[PDB]
Nucleic acid binder design. Sequence first.
DNA 1: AGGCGCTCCAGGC
Length: 865
Amino acid sequence: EQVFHFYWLDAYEDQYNQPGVVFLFGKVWIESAETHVSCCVMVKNIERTLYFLPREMKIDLNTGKETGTPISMKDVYEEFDEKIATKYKIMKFKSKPVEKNYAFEIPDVPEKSEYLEVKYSAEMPQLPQDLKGETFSHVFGTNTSSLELFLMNRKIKGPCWLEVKSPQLLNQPVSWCKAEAMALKPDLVNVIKDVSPPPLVVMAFSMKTMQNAKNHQNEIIAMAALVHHSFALDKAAPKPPFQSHFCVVSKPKDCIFPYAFKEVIEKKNVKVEVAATERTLLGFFLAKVHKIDPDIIVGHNIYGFELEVLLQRINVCKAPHWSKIGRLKRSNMPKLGFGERNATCGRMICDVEISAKELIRCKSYHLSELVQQILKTERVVIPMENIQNMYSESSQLLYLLEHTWKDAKFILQIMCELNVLPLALQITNIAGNIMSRTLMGGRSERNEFLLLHAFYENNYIVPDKQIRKKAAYAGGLVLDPKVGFYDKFILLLDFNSLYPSIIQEFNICFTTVQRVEQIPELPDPSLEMGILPREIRKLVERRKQVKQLMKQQDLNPDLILQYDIRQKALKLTANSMYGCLGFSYSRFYAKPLAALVTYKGREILMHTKEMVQKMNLEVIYGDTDSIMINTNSTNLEEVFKLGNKVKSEVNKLYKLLEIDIDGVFKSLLLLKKKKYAALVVEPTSDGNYVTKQELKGLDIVRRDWCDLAKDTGNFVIGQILSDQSRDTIVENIQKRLIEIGENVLNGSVPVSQFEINKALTKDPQDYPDKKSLPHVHVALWINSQGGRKVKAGDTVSYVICQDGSNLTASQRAYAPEQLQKQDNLTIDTQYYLAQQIHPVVARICEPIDGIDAVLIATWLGLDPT
DNA sequence: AGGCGCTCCAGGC
Ligand SMILES: Nc1ccn([C@H]2C[C@H](O)[C@@H](COP(=O)(O)OP(=O)(O)OP(=O)(O)O)O2)c(=O)n1
Ligand SMILES: [K+]
Ligand SMILES: [Mg+2]
Ligand SMILES: [Zn+2]
Ligand SMILES: [Zn+2]
Ligand SMILES: [Zn+2]
């Protein structure tokens, strides 16, 4: 024969222009060059695969009555061959009887049955989905895409090594890869698992734009990029994260570069290419992408801005070879990240903004905010305006260029810090989907792929693809809290992986629960574990392993964070598997199952509450799978004993479900359901312990209150949870608030602390009642005013100012720059004292005797009425 | 395009 090895990373199909064809992109080892290069493998002749369900008794389609003659596969075969194939224009086909299982939402389909599997060219006509015949009542798989068929049939689960038997040459190159090959049929491709993965080429970049003087245009004037040619995903990121890099700077049109600039560059020796026109800059960038040939391109806000601006400018400046930004040679450039994801076809796009949203929580996911929270460094901002003045002098243009470079580096460092790529790979090998899709975010597509593989594997027919809202069923139970402050130790117990465990513990599955608002019945405990509990179980085991690793002897603070993020990622994946059951647009939608899981959960929480109470214990709170207890004790060692005691008593009732000691608090300020503060006990040696403050749901943790209000609220909390007597505390609180009130009025407070942040659920243009929505109003300004544009999902920062226009506070929202720059605008001190600080402190002091709302108003110098 | 539970604010009636 003849065979070659290929490590695939990305896949792509064009069902309209090239049905039955799948393009694979990956790596190949080239011995003569001792390096891996890119390769494109075009897989052809992927055939549609349909399953015809035979009727019990034959039917006549002209009368619509049975005939008395039963059915046999020969009957079905003949009908397809004689009437169906001929009527629908299917020249060739192959078929065979098979036995498949079914367990989904189409009524009148038996659990197990024999089917006539038919296969034919994807180039031939697609049969109607609701097609029926004389011998068959239903047909499955009429609309399955080639990519799905390929991945499922070949059992490909994320990036891996493949052997391609009998490769063919192509008359003409179809990609921008170094190597190419073609497979005439899918069965020539096989997964192999005994070859270590190859390292990848990773490219991180950033760009700068500039609004042009006259015409309205965002011109790209600088780009920076860092590259690593051997970035391994099965180990710690390389240090340093890049081996090379390059920069390119261009002039708008009317401007002229500072002189000696060239020399200044040769002098300081920076790998900077000074382009004369934007078109040149773009042509150069694309040439660099083609030559470097990255498997992964990383940026910040790529999908929302950068990528669209790049393609548009490439089109406007008529830059040469736009398709080099991807790995597939194309001609027509698509626009609007669909058209985008396609534009980079073959190259995975990692957007740290998107990845950060999935892995951690921030007040905003803008680059400065991320560099601060994750890299713990400050990032300078260069406003589009100041840009122009920079071209005037050499050092300025040079500074701007170094700045762009710094952003490319920040982006890359954030990617490594969050360990984004290894995580995305792990999730892709688990779900068996496509890595570039994993990186775009979303839990549903992954869960669908995970289930598709599992059901194909177990020989099941799967549903065909089909073509915040109000709750549609009951969820978790939240206990009514016993609001107040607590001095004695509090015990918090929480069940491990509750829902995933409930699914296993009661064997809930598409295959074991009868259904069709009514809660189904638990299946007979004799039945064998179903696909769902097994798959769910595997996600829980993986999570336990990672938690075991964290438990280990003295580890790095950086690594510990990575393990914690990963552990939560696996938690979210298992919970998303439960959630998709209740996702109306899910391919495996099964609401009764979702409702049964939540039902058992509330039941279990109620029983655990009543049980702790029978032990004569005080249950002051509980959320879905937790129980909070006031031990009233001051003896830590005793509390822990009591904890393990209740734990043991509870776990005694279940086969798999296990409750644990989530934590112990030294002091607790419980305000309302899902809202509390506390000093958390952290044992050291000899029953000794340190203590750490922890907030849950308070206004202090939200993004939509200013720092001034939030820092002040945190001060109060720190004082309340304190050792100090109630008296000393109340005094300190007053002492501090009176002070804050003065500082706000005398103008001692940094303008940044007045900023309020809110994310837009929709694009600012899609709001009818706009004007009175401060964040939507500042976004409409920002947008219509300059370069970048805010869209659904972005958070907007703003401040309330004195306009001198007597409109409501909500109608006097302005951008920070807009305030600092404009003179008629000034901070509305009254608004901040009464609508920000007062509301926050009042809710926090609500249960504290001695403080009161009226009082808090007088400290702030507000008229109590 | 994982689920549902529980505040908070602007404003008009
Ligand atoms: N993002 C989330 C968080 C929680 N839950 C549901 C399912 C969980 O099983 C249950 C309990 O919430 P937990 O925070 O306690 O999550 P788990 O108990 O499952 O994991 P852990 O072992 O960390 O407690 O609430 C969910 O569906 N989605
Ligand atoms: K009070
Ligand atoms: Mg839990
Ligand atoms: Zn081999
Ligand atoms: Zn709403
Ligand atoms: Zn919990």
